[PDB]
């Protein structure tokens, strides 16, 4: 095995970088862009999409963590099998499943079935990242592969920008009408069909052929490699002199039994240790960082709802009669108003509360009213025409000889007023996307220098100290500042990672056991947004504690791990 | 299907007091505005009442408010219909209902499911 391994990397080490790994590179960049636009979706889509969709707030959650779980399972799924029929094949396999699905996905109209859809959706593009990064380390030679992986982790965040550039430029043309939401679902199902139509162009990486006797199909791939390179280098006189390669329903049950002893090879007494060194470090890693990235905005928008309530004024004591009214009021509170043959039409209302008022002889038509309610108010020969006023809307009233006609049709949930304040979501995830480009920068052009377990556990440890400001931050401005500093210091943590994972398991098994890692990735990603969700507002030292003892945990596994750079990729 | 079953009628001398009480047996009790009507002789299903989803809010027919008090008990899974001042006109038969909707409704129609029926006489 190990001798196949030195002649391996001695071919791909004379040809160098060139033409090939470019190309390359970017071919798979276009998937990875695919993954980063496909995690941003049902977010942008939730204010605009739970009018039409009827979404309650579990709805909202449940659409909220889909994406992962789907995630979770397709990382599991295509991971495993691209060890047995090629990287080439399942990449392809996936990001169509994921580019139909999701393209399906804005031409739906029930709940349940946008539900399935964005699942299936999540389950194709789960297994990009361990496909992506396992198929181009077999083009690479050590001298550099870790700062050449670290350059394929920029394209996420080009996706990540891309999704908030189309939600920006479409979603807040509302009066489109099929809302916007929709075709900004379309769009971004983009990248995944670029993806296909730039991966058919690209040859399965020759180790797979030669893990699976198959030294053929290596050799061959392996000159079309040297005579892209030398083509561009400009040196057609030079021959690929390079002799061969060194030599080593029925279906469905052999594949997955064949994946079923990858998968067990993992824990075997060579791999044991590093394994579970790996799932505490991936595990306590992720749980962190998804716990606080999605912390951050719903800090913002509850410290956002705190400034709205001090910004409420009171109207106590008015008298009205036989006057007509059709103005919007919104953040008021009218107390212990008396309303005498008082004719209210075409009236809207946002964020308006009565208290202790009187109604008699009245006469409601056309009204529209979000978070508008009614307590302990009396109603008398009061006639509802046309009206937005449902049954919750009368908190503790009485209503004598009234009545309700034309009750207007439409969601019965409220809170689904068509536009929220969602301009603050895009700009917040833009600025925490771009937070991580000095990172990647960085990361890329130390990981072969400062190696890779010392620049993941440097991150980590910063990461954790960092995570001690979150107190120091109590305004919106200062958890921008806070978010951006968290997602950009952090960022390298993540690439050392991907790197790290890929060097230490054998060809084949890199595929299995880094998809496994992602699919717990995924899991941790789940419990931590489940578990940080339950603190917004009730204190700040919970989230301090829950986030610094688990990158605690995680830099103390990362150090026990062992060192890949300069070693050559088994 | 939410069965409900009245109780509490019987013969009532003029101007005592009664109660006329609804026993529902579904889980999915909370889910209902809880109506109650009459039946005259002679006449048809007269709205008299109804209570919101949370036992905050009435809704009260007209000429019925200051004799009829509509309150439900959710731990007890019930409904209750207080009359006072019983005149001879309220003979009838009192039937409980429920409506699924998000509406105040007085009409018969829009109500989903009936009572049994209990009978008062003055």
């Known amino acids: 095995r190990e001798e196949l391994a030195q002649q391996y990397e001695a071919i791909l080490r004379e040809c160098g970088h060139g033409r090939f790994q470019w190309t390359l590179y970017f071919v798979l960049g276009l998937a990875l862009m695919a993954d980063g636009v496909e995690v941003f979706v049902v977010g942008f889509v939730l204010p605009s999409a739970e009018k039409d969709m009827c979404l309650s707030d579990s709805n909202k959650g449940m659409l909220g963590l889909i994406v992962y779980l789907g995630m979770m399972v397709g990382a599991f799924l295509w991971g495993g099998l691209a060890d047995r029929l090629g990287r080439r094949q399942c990449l392809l396999i996936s990001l169509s499943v994921n580019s139909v699905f999701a393209f399906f996905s804005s031409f739906v109209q029930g709940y349940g079935t946008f539900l399935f859809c964005r699942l299936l959706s999540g389950v194709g593009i789960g297994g990009s990242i361990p496909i992506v990064f396992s198929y181009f380390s077999e083009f690479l030679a050590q001298e550099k592969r870790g700062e050449h992986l670290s350059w394929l982790c920029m394209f996420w965040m080009i996706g990540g920008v891309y999704a908030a550039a189309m939600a920006w430029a479409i979603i807040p043309h509302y009066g489109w009408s099929f809302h916007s939401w929709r075709v900004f679902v379309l769009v971004c199902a983009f990248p995944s069909v670029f993806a296909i139509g730039a991966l058919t162009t690209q040859p399965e990486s020759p180790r797979f052929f030669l893990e699976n006797g198959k030294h053929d199909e290596a050799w061959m791939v392996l000159k079309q490699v040297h005579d892209t390179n030398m083509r561009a280098k400009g040196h057609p006189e030079r021959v690929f002199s390079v002799t061969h390669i060194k030599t080593i329903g029925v279906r469905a049950l052999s594949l997955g039994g064949q994946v079923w002893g990858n998968f067990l090879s993992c824990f075997g007494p060579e791999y044991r240790r590093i394994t579970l060194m790996m799932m505490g470090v991936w595990f306590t890693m992720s749980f962190s960082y998804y716990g606080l990235t999605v912390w951050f905005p719903d800090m913002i928008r509850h410290l956002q709802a705190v400034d709205y309530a001090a910004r409420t004024k009171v109207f106590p004591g008015e008298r009205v009669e036989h006057v007509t009214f059709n103005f919007t009021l919104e953040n008021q509170i009218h107390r212990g108003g008396q309303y005498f043959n008082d004719k209210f039409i075409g009236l809207r209302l946002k964020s308006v509360s009565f208290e202790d008022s009187l109604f008699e002889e009245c006469y409601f038509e056309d009204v529209t009213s979000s978070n508008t309610f009614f307590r302990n108010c009396t109603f008398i020969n009061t006639v509802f025409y046309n009206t937005d006023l449902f049954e919750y809307k009368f908190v503790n009233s009485r209503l004598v000889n009234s009545t309700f006609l034309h009750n207007k049709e439409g969601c019965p949930l409220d809170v689904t007023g068509t536009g929220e304040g969602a301009y603050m979501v895009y700009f917040v995830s833009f600025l925490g996307t771009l937070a991580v480009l000095p990172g990647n920068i960085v990361s890329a052009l130390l990981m072969d220098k400062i190696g890779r377990l010392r620049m993941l556990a440097g991150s980590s440890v910063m990461s954790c100290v960092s995570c001690f400001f979150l107190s120091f931050g109590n305004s919106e401005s200062a958890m921008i500042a806070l978010l951006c500093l968290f997602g950009g210091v952090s960022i390298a943590s993540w690439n050392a990672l991907d790197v790290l994972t890929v060097e230490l398991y054998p060809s084949d098994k890199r595929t299995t056991a880094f998809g496994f890692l992602n699919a717990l990735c995924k899991l941790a990603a789940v419990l931590g947004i489940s578990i940080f969700t339950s603190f917004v507002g009730i204190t700040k030292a919970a989230p301090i504690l829950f986030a610094s003892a688990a990158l605690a945990l995680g830099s103390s596994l990362a150090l026990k791990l062992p060192e890949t750079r300069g070693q050559v990729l088994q | 299907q939410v069965q409900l079953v009245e109780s509490g009628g019987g013969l009532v001398q003029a101007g005592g007091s009664l109660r006329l009480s609804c026993a529902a047996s579904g889980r999915t009790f909370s889910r209902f505005i809880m109506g109650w009507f009459r039946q005259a002789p002679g006449k048809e299903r007269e709205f008299v009442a109804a209570?919101?989803?949370?036992?905050?809010?009435?809704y009260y027919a007209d000429s019925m408010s200051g004799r009829f008090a509509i309150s439900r008990d959710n731990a007890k899974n019930t409904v209750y219909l207080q009359m006072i001042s019983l005149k001879p006109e309220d003979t009838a038969v009192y039937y409980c209902?429920?409506?699924?909707?998000?509406?105040?409704?007085?009409?018969?129609?829009?109500?989903?499911?009936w009572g049994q029926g209990t009978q008062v006489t003055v």
């Open positions: 209570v919101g989803k949370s036992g905050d809010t009435t």
């Open positions: 209902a429920a409506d699924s909707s998000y509406f105040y409704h007085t009409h018969e129609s829009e109500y989903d499911y």
